[PDB]
Design a protein around this nucleic acid. Structure first.
Ligand SMILES: [Mg+2]
Ligand SMILES: [Mg+2]
Ligand SMILES: [Mg+2]
Lengths: 114, 134
RNA sequence: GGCACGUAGCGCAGCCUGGUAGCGCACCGUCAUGGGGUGUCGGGGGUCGGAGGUUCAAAUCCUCUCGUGCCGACCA
RNA sequence: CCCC
RNA sequence: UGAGCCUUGAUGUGUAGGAUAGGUGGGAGGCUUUGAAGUGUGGACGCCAGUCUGCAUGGAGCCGACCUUGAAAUACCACC
């Protein structure tokens, strides 16, 4: 309801709110509720704050919103520093997940201009 | 079609006969048929074409007997809704309250007027057949 | 003075008759065909000649202006 | 509709 | 037989939202038995969504304020 400072995962199950949290995904929520000692069958609207602060303390061990994009940007600045092919391609605003580029990258390369 | 009320008040005035000032303050007892302090409206028909931005009117009336400081403004087509007061407020004083209204307007007569400024003064009642005086 | 034209490259509706730039031709990429066209299918392409005001908002109301027309008027 |  | 015109008849979907509501806008009691609201239906307009009138059965009952609307009710009255 308040975790992470900004995100309100209201009416989300205990681990579903953590999968929907900004920074982590599918298994880290399970890992958090296992390291904290909570089950995942009820929404966030039933667990009191006596444990929500503990969930927020336990998630303070990973990279969070403010450092997530900034570690990504540190890597991207390493790309703008080196000059390698993934810096060249990334410095032209091109799609994001592999190697094939010629015929089918149209969603993230945008529709055809002319 | 109607009750006894509305018909005898329409059969107490004349629209084809444009009444006069001194003739006007005799009939507002026959034009008043409400059980309270009912009002009497005035309409001023004007003689300019207001379709132009330059011809807006705006001012306040210093009432010679109070009601009382009321603002006014003309219409875009040439008929402004004003008021003299009520029907029981000394009908004979209502003519003297008609006096002070219009002499303040010709003093602030706009210079960008086209043709005659005024056209007609309808001293009408809120619950009866109107009266259109020259 | 007096009224009629400006709307995509072109021709126009709408017009210079009130709320939401549309039609046709032109152009680009498909589909249609054994090969083509007409044709259907999408996409760009203009902010209503300019400006200024009325609006709950103009294009569609009003004033000035610009270019082009036509009638008429014009004895430093 | 055009054409081989 | 057009034009101008007094009276009367009668008029101008926006969406919002009780609401075919023009610029104002004075305005809260009209309404009612020189013979109700609902209805019985002939007629009118119609983007027919609704305004709405003749004789009435019913025969004396609704509403302005009362809430959401760029607007309030055209309840009366006002000149177009
Ligand atoms: Mg790419
Ligand atoms: Mg000459
Ligand atoms: Mg052959």
């Amino acid at each position: 309801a308040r975790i992470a400072g900004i995100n309100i995962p209201d009416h989300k199950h205990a681990v579903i709110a953590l999968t929907s949290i900004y920074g982590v995904g599918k298994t880290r929520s399970k890992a958090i509720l296992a390291a904290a000692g909570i089950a995942e069958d009820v929404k966030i609207s039933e667990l009191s704050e006596g444990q929500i602060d503990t969930l927020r303390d336990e998630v303070a061990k990973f990279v969070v919103e403010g450092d997530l994009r900034r570690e990504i940007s540190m890597s991207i600045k390493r790309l703008m520093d080196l000059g390698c092919y993934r810096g060249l391609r990334h410095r032209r605003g091109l799609p994001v997940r592999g190697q094939r580029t010629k015929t089918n990258a149209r969603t993230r390369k945008g529709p055809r201009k002319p | 079609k109607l009750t006894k009320r509305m018909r005898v008040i329409r059969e107490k005035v004349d629209a084809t006969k444009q009444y006069d000032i001194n003739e006007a303050i005799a009939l507002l007892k026959e034009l008043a048929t409400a059980k309270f302090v009912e009002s009497v409206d005035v309409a001023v028909n004007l003689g300019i074409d207001a379709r132009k931005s330059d011809q807006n009117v705006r001012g306040a009336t210093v009432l010679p007997h109070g009601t009382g400081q009321v603002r006014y403004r003309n219409d875009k087509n040439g008929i402004i809704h004003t008021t003299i007061g009520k029907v029981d407020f000394d009908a004979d004083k209502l003519k003297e309250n008609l006096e002070a209204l219009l002499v303040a307007l010709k003093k602030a007569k706009p210079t960008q007027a086209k043709g005659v400024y005024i056209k007609k003064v309808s001293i009408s009642t809120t619950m009866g057949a109107g009266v259109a005086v020259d």
